[PDB]
Structure formats: structure tokens, C-alpha cells
């Protein structure tokens, strides 16, 4: 899943300490990240389940509570 | 406007710098061409597969053309061929002029085709291709730009595109479509249209044949004059026709001089028998002038 | 002095690579032009504001110039106009030759004008411009390079500058400044000089008129060959003048041939009557060539 | 050999291929323009050699400027290096040899940079480190610079892997020593590239003018009138072309060919086919005979 | 900086972009209107500082109302916060320092909100949670409200990332302590923004009226010309100064006309003495114009 990552510094031209293409540089605003996230898409067949999944619902909360341990810090 | 980028230490690297630089270099090249050539734009190659005309399909095979605004199209090296033109909607016609269409630039950006639809056609398309690094031994996929080319018919609205003629299709005796044997695109290179080269070859032949007949006869003012005119022209026309790889403007001037001289003694032709050069419509220039020369010579 | 970059593998993104490529690209384009033309440089446009001359000030409105080293100036598409020229210190003169000047490239650097003072004039200026991307939608600012153009007098020291004529001023009967009615800068495009267009149009007219008279009319040897000379020359001269956007060298050659032939009929003048081509000083080339042709055609 | 126009996409990985392709296109475009006016837009501009060590079987170049027939421009004055010294020690068995400037072919499959390794085929590109100063500012540092791999090879050697363009010819002198052939013309891009031809052209103009004056002095004599006209018509243009010898030969050939054509209307002894066809690769078979013909014809009257 | 005006259809999602872009457009329209009558619709409306701590190298703003060059209105009285106190300890070496109000430039690519992290580019917006009273009903609650990242910066230090507008100048006094420059004028949006100017203008009016009354009593076309000019200008200049809450451009033109007429009879003054209007540097506009007018009035 693609996410945009802010850069610490923009890509610029220099004389004393120039950037090597070995770094695979990109323009200075944002870089892509396709190794940090996955997409989990849900689908329900009833209003009860939907309300549970909506923010504030009990299913939304429970799922995050489980991801906390199951995935931890590995991926978002 | 073209904004030449200022390259310096500490400067940011930006895609706008590259795009503006490219525009400048094209402009500069165009400026140079115009120093000697009145009309730098025109057709270099217009080769079609006409074997599919019996099945109502026109399929280009190799198109090379410089457009009126300096844009260079090169199928062989950089561009893709246009989609095959469907002639089934031409059923009720007996003659169709086909042009190559190129969408014109959007001054305020949005020139690249992102797959969306709009009132004004996009000019550029993005494709992914495999490019070999010349220096080393590695390959990678990069993004390249292609022009959004398409074939359109002259009788269709073409306001949104710049156009340049490439072929003309006419109904044959069998009711089948075929390429018109006597059609000339606005040419940039003489070799682009064999029809013209053939007629030029016939002219050269006749000039040589007549010159030899006259020369063997060497009150003699007409004889000497005609020989002089023919002898002067031959060494130049020859070269121009041997290597048909240049702007037709050069040929026109030479042919015009020959016709100009010959008309001096001719009585059966008008003073202004020599046509003006019409770059956009060579069919109203060359075959006329050549026909004139053949008559002036035969006389 | 031009170091084409080597873009391979782990290349370094240094500002020098870009500057050197640009230098080459201009050189290469210039090399091509030189294949057919001896002098691929000169004036394309030189329009000035005449309303300031009464107030001792000269200000260009549109300049298109190509310098002797391939540098292309275009104040319609990419460049800015030069600062207003103060003629006060030139007042003592009755005739002033004005040239467009651009400081020479410094091989040792320091070409960019950073506002500091130096003994050698800077040639580049940095301007910030908000430039719209063509491919996408995003708009952002870049550093745009402008030439440090200025107007200078021909009589001034110009060692540090490339330069060419753009206009000449003279004092009128009332003492006020006025552009010289018959000045021609080194031309790159024939159409750059309106006065030349007029004179050439007159020539073509007279040529055609004489042709038609002789043509209708047709000692008879002279008639046939005089007519031949006109019939041969006219079709091409016409094409050259109908679409008058070519380098002067092409026109010169065609006109010279016609003059050459006509001098075969006249005994009232020399055979070296046809002037040599001079790019810098076209005033001594075309005006007399054209006068010669007009007189010879009239003599018939 | 494809040439792509790279898309400078914002945020995309920046690649060395983008730069190589951008440069290739710009060169292609420049070449395309040249070809609109000239049939053969390539050849020698400069070929100045150092023959001081030639008596000792060593030939070296001092300045080479050659446009190769693939749009590549080589310039050892401001862009490239001079080639290695040609060792004629293995050429001593010959009485006459031609030297060609060789530039390795550009391989579409890569491997065009010389990394010092052994290979069955020559590399076109070399890597040189040059301390290059920035123009805008004052800062200076070492940057990689491309140099072309040029070398001097003998015409009789296998040259399939190189583009070649003749630069000079050597012959054996009376003493058995090598010397440069006084009458050699390489494919020319500019007239000034060959002093020999230029000298002959200057002589022609002189004779043309001298003969013209005699005819003027002597002015139903259609012969004189006809010929005199031809000379007065030609000179005003031929002079200009020779005064500034910095144009592609095609322009000069054309003008001279017309003069020869006209003059062959008078001569009966000479044949109408006396005027040679233009050949770019071997100018020696074009100009030397054309010029000889013109002199012979002018002398007729 | 494209503005993407939102469309509302039969049914749709609400999005942050719709609200942000709609606000941007409305600001644009307001700016467009201002520019129909005024060349420079930006500058200082008000600026006040607490000088109590100035002797201890602290510059503490108390009120700032400034319209920025890009249509952004900052008002710390009605809808914004005051900037952090500027520490003058780092410029102790200098006898004079200019202070400007800086506002970080908008990032077209986002990341404008300050999330407390550090970065090269200053953030423009801050999020402050305050209790906002509903107007219709009687309830109030916490709402995230946008505040600007305002700060005072030294005029001489690099300010590339900020849009700036001068607010005050400090100098060293006889005691070596910092104090405010008695005659500093920032780019003004309203006359009331600079009391120093108001005072001088009031003095001018006084002298003008006195000159008028004396001349009127003493009653050669010079007499009438000078008197006419005074009588014509006074009824307008008075109104402008009575309600000093309008753009300086209006005042400038009236004063300029007066100076113009007076200079007609003066034989010692330069007709070009009247300065051009400069919005950024008003100090070179009004102080010399007013000085000229005072001299011209005295030279009766």
C-alpha cells in the first residue's frame, strides 16, 4: 500500500558534497513508500455490523486492540 | 515564454528546469533551420500498409513528420504508430483525404493524459519502457513521453489538432479503396514521395536525350542558346535528383530557372506559366511546372 | 573548454554538468548553422520607442539578436529589455552609433551578478519566476537566467563586451534626436529592415515591368539575351521576396548574378561594379547593388 | 537504435538513463536540421599533423576536428583529446598509405564505456577526471568528463568496428623516409580544411578574371557575347564563396558545375560528360578534374 | 497555487479539501476587489509594543494588525495570537536594527500545520483548542481554531522562508540602551498606523490654513494662483486628515497635486522634486514631500 513520506532535505545541486545517483534520489518534496503499509478492506451485510465498525463502535476498538499485539510495530 | 533555468551551487533540482530547457533547445534548432529554409516543416515518411484497404482499414507503418510548430514526430525512433483508422464510416464517399493529427499545447498545463476525459484532447502520453544504459551493462524501466497521435479525415472537425496530410484514398474500378497514385503530402524530403521522383526522373531523361540530339547539330542563336540553357542546368539538376534527400525548395528554384529561360523562345505559353511555390499543396506546383517543362522541351 | 558530462552509474549531481552540457548544445547548434552560412548571426528585430528621443533617452521595445558566438537574445520570449540609455553625455555629438552589448563569459567564473561591484561586468542575472509545469498541474518558482543586456555607444571602450549595431541617431534640423532614416544593422533575417523591403519591392516591380515590355516586343540577339536574363532571374527573385524570411546571403548571390549578366550589355560602367558582401556593414552592399540593378534595367 | 524523450516526472526515481536519452535526442534534432539543406553533412574541418617525428616513423596530430556520419562531433581543440601517436614501424613495407581517424561504434546493447578491461570490441567512451570551475560562482572541483576514444588507424587495416574518416596520406620520399602527400584531400566539411584545394581554387579565380579582362577588351560575334556573359555571371558568386572558405563543398561544386556546363557549349573537342559527378567520400575525383577542365576550357578563347 | 472550487451534488462526501479550497477562493475574491482601486492593498494598520522591557533587550508586541502582500490578514486583536518576545541580545553589537513581522510561506504540497516537530521549513499554521460559543443557542464547546505562526525577525538575517512586513525600528540611545526610532514608518495600509506622520500632516494643515487666511485678507496673478491652489486643496485635505483611516494612495495624490501647482511659480525648486510613490519605503515619500510643501508655503 502506497504512502507518501516527507523528506528531511530537498534534492539540490552541490559542488563540495554532491549527491550520487547510487542513492536513487527523487525530487525534494515527497518520496514514496510501498513497504510500510498494507490495506485491510472490510465489507458487511447488515447495519448492526456497520455501526460496530464505524469509529466509536465496539468492533473498531476491538480490532485495533488486537492489531496492537498481532502486528505490533512491524507494519501499519 | 521560455524560461531558461539558472544552474548553480545550492539551487534546487526541479522538473520545470528540464521542461523549460527542452523547449529552449527546440526553439534554437528551429531558429537555425529558418536561416536558409522558408518552410522547415513537412513530411519525411508516410508509409502505409494498404493491403487492408479491401477490409476498410488504414494502417500506418512508418510516419516521420515535422509539424508547423517545430514538433518532430519520429515513429522509427521515438513515437508510437496511431490506431488503425476505420473506413466503414466512409462508405458513402468516393475520395478521402487523411491527415495526421496532433493535439496542440495547453498554455496553463495539464498536457499529459492521465486517463480522464476532457473537452480539449491531451497532447502527451506516459509509457513505461525498458531502457539499456549505454555506459554499463544494466537495464531498467523508465517513464517516457509519446505524442498522442491519431489519424483523422479532412472532412471531420479538426480545430483542436494541428494537421498534416499523409495519404489520400480513392475508390478504384472494383469499388475497393486504394491509395491515390498521384498524391503529394507537403514534403520536407523529396524521397518522401516516389510519385514525384518518378516524374523528375522522366524529365532528366528527356533533357539528356534532347540535349544530345541538339548537340550533334553543332541563325544558330536558337541552337546555341538552347544548348547553353540545357548544358548549364544538367550538372545541377542531376545532383539534386541523384540524392533526393533535402528540402524541395532547392529543387524548385533550379527547375524554375530552367523554365524561365526556355519560355523566352516559346510562344504558345503565358509569361507567368511558372507556378508559385505552395508548400502546403505541392500538387499545385510540381506536376504543373514539370508538365510545362516537358512541353517547352519537346517543342 | 567544454567538458561534456559522463552520465553513467553513480554520477554526481553537480551544477557543472548542467552548465557544460548547455555550452555544448549551443556550440553544436552553431556549428550546424555554419555549414551553409558564413555569418549565422545578426539582427532579427530592433524596435525602439521614438517618443523619448525629445527627452535625450533611448529605450528599446523589442530586441531579437543573435551574437557571433551563438548566443540568442529574444526579449519577446525569454529576455528582458535593457535599461534606458541616457544620451546626455553624448550631447556634444551630431551622430551616434548605438550597439547592443553583452559582457564576455569569464572562463574563471564570477559570471553571475550578485549585486557586488567589480572591474569586469557580470553577464548573468538571477530572476525568480513562478513557472507552471507543462506535464502536470503543479506550479512553483525557479531561478531563471536572464542576460545582462545594455545599450552602449560605439565610440566607448567595449573590450569586455560582445556587441552589434541596433540603431543610429542623428540630430535633426531642430537639434532634437531622430533615428537615421537609412540605417541598416547586420541582418540575420531579411525582413528585419523595413526600408530594405521597400527597395526590393520596387526592384521586383521594375524588373517585371521591363520583362513584360521586352517579352511582348519580341540586333534581335541582344533583345533575346537581355530578355532571357530577365526571364531567368525573375522567377527566383520573386520567390526570395515573396516569403522574405531568409538570411541575406541567399538574396545577395541571386542579385549579384543578375547584375553580372546585365553588365554584359552595358559599356557605360565597370565589370567590378558589383560590391562584395559585407555582413557587418550591409549599408555598403545592398543599397549600391540595388541602385546598380535599377540603373541597368532602366538603361535596357 | 531508439531515442526516447524522457518524462521528467516529479517524485519518480531519477535515473542515469534519463540524461543519456535527453542528450541523444538533442543531438538527433541538430543532425536532422543539418540534413534539410545538405546531402552529406559530415567530414573534416581540421586535420593538422605534427610531422617533425615523421622521419623517425612517428605521426601525431596537433588538431583534429571531424564530424562523423552519426551526428557525433569530435573536437580536440575544445572537447576531446588527441589520439595516440601512430607507429609506422610496421608500415615500412609500403610505398603509400592512408591514415583514417577511427571512432568505435556505439553499441545499443551497452558496454560503451572503457573500464580498462579486455574486450573483442573497442569502447567509444572514456572517463577523465577534470577540475572544472563553476561559471556562475567561484567554486571549483573534480567532475567526471566524457572523452571519445579516438585513434589513428591505417586504411588497409580491418576497420569494421569503427566509423572512419580519412585525415592524411603518407608516401615514401627519395631517401626512403616518410613524408606527407602534397596532394591529398579528405572528405571536407569546410573548404579551409584543405590548403591544397584552396590554393588551386584561388588560382582558378585569377585565371577566370584575367581571361575575362581580355574578352572585355575585345568587346554578329555571338561567340564572344555568349562566353563573356557566362564569365561575368559566374565571377560575382564564385569570388564570395572563395573569399570566405567556410561552407560545405556542395555549394561550391554546384556553382562551378554551372560554369563548366556553359563553357562546354563552346568547346567541341571536350565532351559534355567532362564534368564529374559529385562524390563526398572521395573529393579527389571531383575537384582536381573539374578544376583542370575549367582551366582547359577558359584557355580556349 | 491553483484553487479548486468545490462542487456540491445531489449527494456526496464532505472533504477537508472542499472547505480549504472554498476559503481560499473567497480570500482571492476579496483581494481581487481591493486591487481594482488600489495598487498596493497591503501593509500595516496598527502596531503597538510594550517598551517596558526594552531596556532589558526584550521587544514585546502588544497588538499587530497587518495585511500581507498575498491577501492574508493578521489581526491579533480580533482573531489571532501575538508573536513570541524578540531577544535583542544577539544584535548588541549594532547601533541600529530593523524588525519585521514574519509569516511562513504556504506550502503548495501540504505539511502546513505545525505538529510540534522540527524541520528546515517553518510551519505556517498552529492548532489551538478554545471554547467557542454558539451564536444561535446557549451551548459552547471546544473547537480547533487556526492560528498563524507569527514571529518577529531581524531584518538583516536571512528571511527566505517567510513573507515579511516591517513593524518597528530600534536604535541605541545615549545611554547605550535600545529605544524606538522616533521617525520610523512601515508600509502603511491606513494613515492611523503611524502617529508620526499624522502629526506632521496636522502641522502642514495648520500652516496651510494660516497662509491661506493671511493671503485672503491681503486682497498680479501670482496672488490668485497661490490662493486658488490653497483654497482648492484645503477642503479635501482636511477631510482626509479628519478621518485618517484610508489608504495613503489617496493622500499622496492630493499632496502631489498641491506640490505640482506650487512649483509652477517657484524659481529655485526642481519641478521633479516631488518623489514617486513607494509603498515599501514610505520614508522616502512622505517626509520629503511634506518638507517640500512646507518650504513652498513659506516661500510666498
UniProtKB/TrEMBL annotation, chain A:
<protein>
    <submittedName>
        <fullName>Type VI secretion protein</fullName>
    </submittedName>
</protein>
From TrEMBL, chain E:
<protein>
    <submittedName>
        <fullName>Type VI secretion protein</fullName>
    </submittedName>
</protein>
Amino acid at each position: 500500500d502506497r504512502r507518501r513520506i516527507p523528506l528531511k532535505t530537498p534534492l539540490t545541486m552541490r559542488v563540495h558534497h554532491p549527491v550520487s545517483l547510487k542513492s536513487r534520489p527523487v525530487m525534494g518534496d515527497h518520496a514514496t513508500d510501498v513497504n510500510g503499509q498494507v490495506l485491510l478492506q472490510l465489507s458487511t451485510q447488515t447495519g448492526s455490523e456497520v455501526q460496530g465498525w464505524l469509529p466509536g463502535g465496539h468492533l473498531y476498538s476491538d480490532l485495533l486492540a488486537l492489531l496492537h499485539v498481532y502486528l505490533g510495530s512491524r507494519l501499519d | 515564454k521560455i524560461y531558461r533555468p539558472l544552474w548553480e551551487d545550492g539551487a534546487f533540482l526541479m522538473p520545470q528546469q528540464f521542461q523549460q530547457q527542452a523547449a529552449w533547445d527546440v526553439h534554437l534548432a528551429d531558429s537555425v533551420a529558418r536561416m536558409g529554409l522558408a518552410h522547415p516543416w513537412g513530411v519525411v515518411a508516410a508509409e502505409f500498409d494498404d493491403s487492408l484497404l479491401p477490409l476498410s482499414r488504414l494502417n500506418a507503418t512508418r510516419l516521420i513528420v515535422r509539424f508547423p510548430d517545430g514538433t518532430l514526430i519520429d515513429t522509427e525512433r521515438a513515437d508510437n504508430l496511431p490506431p488503425v483508422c476505420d473506413l466503414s464510416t466512409v462508405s458513402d464517399r468516393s475520395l478521402v483525404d487523411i491527415v495526421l493529427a496532433l493535439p496542440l499545447l495547453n498554455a496553463n498545463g495539464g498536457n499529459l493524459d492521465n486517463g480522464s476525459e476532457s473537452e480539449r484532447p491531451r497532447r502527451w502520453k506516459s509509457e513505461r519502457v525498458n531502457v539499456q544504459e549505454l555506459a554499463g551493462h544494466e537495464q531498467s524501466e523508465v517513464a517516457v513521453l509519446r505524442h498522442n497521435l491519431t489519424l483523422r479525415m479532412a472532412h471531420q472537425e479538426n480545430a483542436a489538432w494541428l494537421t498534416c496530410p499523409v495519404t489520400r484514398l480513392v475508390r478504384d474500378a472494383q469499388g475497393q479503396w486504394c491509395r491515390d497514385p498521384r498524391f503529394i503530402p507537403p514534403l520536407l524530403t523529396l524521397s518522401a514521395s516516389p510519385s514525384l521522383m518518378t516524374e523528375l526522373a522522366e524529365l532528366l531523361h528527356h533533357l539528356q536525350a534532347r540535349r544530345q540530339r541538339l548537340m550533334s547539330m553543332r541563325a544558330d542563336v536558337s541552337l546555341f542558346w538552347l544548348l547553353n540553357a540545357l548544358n548549364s542546368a544538367e550538372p545541377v539538376l542531376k545532383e539534386l535528383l541523384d540524392m533526393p534527400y533535402r528540402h524541395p525548395e532547392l529543387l524548385y528554384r533550379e527547375l524554375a530557372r530552367l523554365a524561365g529561360s526556355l519560355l523566352t523562345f516559346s510562344l504558345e505559353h503565358n509569361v507567368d506559366a511558372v507556378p508559385a511555390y505552395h508548400h502546403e499543396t505541392p500538387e499545385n506546383v510540381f506536376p504543373p511546372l514539370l508538365s510545362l517543362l516537358n512541353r517547352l522541351l519537346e517543342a
